[PDB]
Amino acid sequence: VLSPADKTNVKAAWGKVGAHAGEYGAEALERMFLSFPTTKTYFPHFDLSHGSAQVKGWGKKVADALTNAVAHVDDMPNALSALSDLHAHKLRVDPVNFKLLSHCLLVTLAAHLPAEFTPAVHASLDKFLASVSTVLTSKYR
Amino acid sequence: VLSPADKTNVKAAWGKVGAHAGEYGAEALERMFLSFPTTKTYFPHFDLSHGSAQVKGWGKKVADALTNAVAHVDDMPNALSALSDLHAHKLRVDPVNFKLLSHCLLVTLAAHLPAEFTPAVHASLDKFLASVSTVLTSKYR
Amino acid sequence: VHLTPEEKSAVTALWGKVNVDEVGGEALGRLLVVYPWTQRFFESFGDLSTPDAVMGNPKVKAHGKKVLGAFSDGLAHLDNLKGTFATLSELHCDKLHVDPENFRLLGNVLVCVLAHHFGKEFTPPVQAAYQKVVAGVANALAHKYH
Amino acid sequence: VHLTPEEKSAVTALWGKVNVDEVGGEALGRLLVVYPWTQRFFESFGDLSTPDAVMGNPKVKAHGKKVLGAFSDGLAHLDNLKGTFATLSELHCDKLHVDPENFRLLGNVLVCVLAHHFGKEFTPPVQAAYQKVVAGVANALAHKYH
Ligand code: HEM
Ligand code: HEM
Ligand code: HEM
Numbered sequence: 041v042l043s044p045a046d047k048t049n050v051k052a053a054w055g056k057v058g059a060h061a062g063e064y065g066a067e068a069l070e071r072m073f074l075s076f077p078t079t080k081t082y083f084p085h086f087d088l089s090h091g092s093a094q095v096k097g098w099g100k101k102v103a104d105a106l107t108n109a110v111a112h113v114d115d116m117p118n119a120l121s122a123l124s125d126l127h128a129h130k131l132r133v134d135p136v137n138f139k140l141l142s143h144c145l146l147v148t149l150a151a152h153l154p155a156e157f158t159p160a161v162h163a164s165l166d167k168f169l170a171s172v173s174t175v176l177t178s179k180y181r
Numbered sequence: 182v183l184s185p186a187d188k189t190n191v192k193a194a195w196g197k198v199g200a201h202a203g204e205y206g207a208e209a210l211e212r213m214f215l216s217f218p219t220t221k222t223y224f225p226h227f228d229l230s231h232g233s234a235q236v237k238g239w240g241k242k243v244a245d246a247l248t249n250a251v252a253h254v255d256d257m258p259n260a261l262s263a264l265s266d267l268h269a270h271k272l273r274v275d276p277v278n279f280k281l282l283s284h285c286l287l288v289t290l291a292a293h294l295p296a297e298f299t300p301a302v303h304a305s306l307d308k309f310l311a312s313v314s315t316v317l318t319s320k321y322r
Numbered sequence: 323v324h325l326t327p328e329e330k331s332a333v334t335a336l337w338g339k340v341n342v343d344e345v346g347g348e349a350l351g352r353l354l355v356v357y358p359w360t361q362r363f364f365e366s367f368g369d370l371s372t373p374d375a376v377m378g379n380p381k382v383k384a385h386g387k388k389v390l391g392a393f394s395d396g397l398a399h400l401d402n403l404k405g406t407f408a409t410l411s412e413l414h415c416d417k418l419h420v421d422p423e424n425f426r427l428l429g430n431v432l433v434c435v436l437a438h439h440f441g442k443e444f445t446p447p448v449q450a451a452y453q454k455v456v457a458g459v460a461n462a463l464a465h466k467y468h
Numbered sequence: 469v470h471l472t473p474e475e476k477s478a479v480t481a482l483w484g485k486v487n488v489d490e491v492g493g494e495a496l497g498r499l500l501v502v503y504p505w506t507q508r509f510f511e512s513f514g515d516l517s518t519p520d521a522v523m524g525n526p527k528v529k530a531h532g533k534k535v536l537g538a539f540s541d542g543l544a545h546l547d548n549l550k551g552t553f554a555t556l557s558e559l560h561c562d563k564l565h566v567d568p569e570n571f572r573l574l575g576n577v578l579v580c581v582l583a584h585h586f587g588k589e590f591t592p593p594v595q596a597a598y599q600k601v602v603a604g605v606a607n608a609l610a611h612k613y614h
């Protein structure tokens with residue numbers, strides 16, 4: 041579970057991210073596509089080039105969903121329910137990929153949070169993204 | 182989440198296993214050691230030889246725990262509480278290994294339940310072992 | 323990868339007893355039932371509404387035959403799986419957009435099907451050999467992804 | 469592994485800036501904090517009770533230096549990672565009994581540390597090159613397991 045310290049750490053880190061959240065979501069997708077090319081199988085309709093507006097648009101929506109999850113950290117399953125449905129029954133992204141995106145989100149946050157990304161905050165963010173991932177895959181079967 | 186239909190499928194299939202549950206747990210362990218040798222890193226001072234009393238004893242304890250979980254499927258976190266403490270705080274088996282054992286348990290059941298291992302029962306069993314695995318790693322961090 | 327001679331012999335011996343069309347249909351159907359997100363490639367295949375509809379679906383059975391027929395032919399080339407599957411790898415990446423995790427899931431399901439079909443004959447050592455094979459095939463089909 | 473020209477260059481260039489001692493201490497400490505079940509291998513290392521205790525622990529820092537030193541040495545042999553790590557592979561299996569999943573976890577924490585320390589210079593293409601490397605080193609250290 042997410043402890044109160046985890047929740048505090050996540051809110052502080054995401055609060056520092058602030059208005060850059062959409063940018064960081066896009067950067068995380070780019071990192072994922074370059075690092076883990078199999079993930080490109082889900083985006084054959086995107087221009088994957090650096091600066092792509094499709095990547096930017098996805099990054100914004102993903103960021104806004106994470107912002108909503110952080111705001112609703114005690115009630116994440118309901119906050120993310122429409123996205124759990126979308127991923128389970130339409131997009132059908134293999135659950136193994138959520139660990140890949142989560143790692144790339146962590147790497148992006150690390151690269152942008154010199155002061156905030158302490159070992160404790162890193163641990164909390166890893167648990168938070170694993171929890172979001174669990175929620176998003178909870179309706180797959 | 183286990184559906185009510187999953188719970189019915191699991192109780193029926195595990196009921197059929199019956200008194201062979203301990204044997205099947207031991208066979209699953211052997212299957213895992215042979216198919217996925219990295220799992221042997223957790224049993225460095227075990228007698229791993231076919232039919233060993235240590236393998237048979239582990240199989241019987243794992244079987245008893247699964248029987249407890251099936252009987253108490255709506256209350257698995259409390260039912261398995263001591264075992265989730267033991268794995269999280271002492272044994273500290275990397276979570277990836279639970280998928281390996283679960284696959285080997287599923288293969289063992291398939292090999293011994295020709296009548297009962299239908300597609301729907303296979304799905305329910307797979308979900309059940311995944312749920313047990315989740316409970317057993319829930320206190321890891 | 324890395325079968326011993328006796329493991330190769332064990333694989334070949336068991337496979338000579340396999341009805342490829344039947345096991346292929348059963349393995350693909352079970353994949354779509356046990357891991358239903360794998361249905362994402364098969365919206366054009368008609369009725370997948372229940373486990374029985376999936377297992378009975380003629381297009382699911384036909385695709386299972388096709389997939390397991392290529393798997394079967396590949397067993398003649400256990401020392402060159404990458405070469406044997408390279409052009410199918412490029413296809414699955416460039417045109418079909420199939421996440422190679424699907425190959426691993428199908429491997430899991432195939433092993434469960436062989437266990438179900440062969441019972442006690444599917445011994446722990448035989449399973450270990452087949453695990454090497456399904457890992458090797460999945461790795462080969464994934465190798466030309468980019 | 470198979471690095472592009474640009475990737476081997478990217479790896480070498482970043483590594484020239486890495487204080488292997490400091491980064492190794494930091495990566496091992498973070499491993500023990502983020503995935504605390506990994507502490508199972510370091511029972512004699514003293515105080516691991518809190519993040520600050522782990523990060524400040526001299527035995528964690530010392531061991532981190534040794535581990536990343538061996539990693540650093542291997543970067544001179546990116547074409548032959550299996551041969552380069554074979555001896556350490558056998559040690560980690562037969563004597564230390566370390567599940568090779570740990571090598572993967574350490575790789576991902578190292579990538580996180582490189583990103584945290586270098587910031588914007590740890591671009592997506594540089595990360596991709598390092599992901600290939602940490603996967604290659606983990607697989608090389610896993611290779612002699614049996
Ligand atoms: C933290 C994890 C994730 C979150 C919060 C998330 C959230 C979202 C959101 C908010 C959208 C847009 C929904 C809409 O347009 O109505 C979306 C779409 C999508 N996501 Fe996820 N997602 C996650 C993980 C993943 C992963 C791991 C993949 C694949 C590697 C993936 C693949 C996709 C794809 C292909 C789309 C549709 C994009 C398009 O066609 O425009 N997602 N997701
Ligand atoms: C369905 C998943 C699992 C269940 C239900 C389970 C259950 C148990 C039980 C009942 C015990 C005996 C506890 C006692 O004697 O007090 C045990 C011990 C142990 N288990 Fe788990 N376990 C599971 C997964 C795993 C996995 C995946 C591994 C490693 C690959 C593992 C490694 C161990 C080890 C090393 C012991 C101690 C053996 C000894 O030295 O006696 N377990 N487990
Ligand atoms: C042992 C693993 C597999 C093998 C050997 C294999 C082989 C094949 C072959 C031989 C074809 C026909 C290519 C052609 O017509 O030129 C094919 C097509 C296809 N495969 Fe795979 N396959 C495997 C696994 C999978 C899996 C797991 C999936 C998805 C869950 C998948 C999805 C597809 C799709 C969507 C097509 C196109 C079918 C059509 O257009 O009717 N394959 N595969």
Ligand code: HEM
Pocket residue numbers: 506509510531534535536538539556560564566570571574605609
């Ligand atoms: C890049 C990955 C790794 C490399 C290159 C590596 C290398 C090494 C080296 C060179 C030593 C011997 C140090 C000496 O001369 O005293 C060693 C020892 C050891 N390593 Fe690893 N290691 C790696 C990852 C890990 C991980 C992830 C773990 C566990 C989480 C681990 C567990 C150990 C342990 C328990 C010892 C013995 C420590 C002791 O003396 O008590 N290694 N490793």
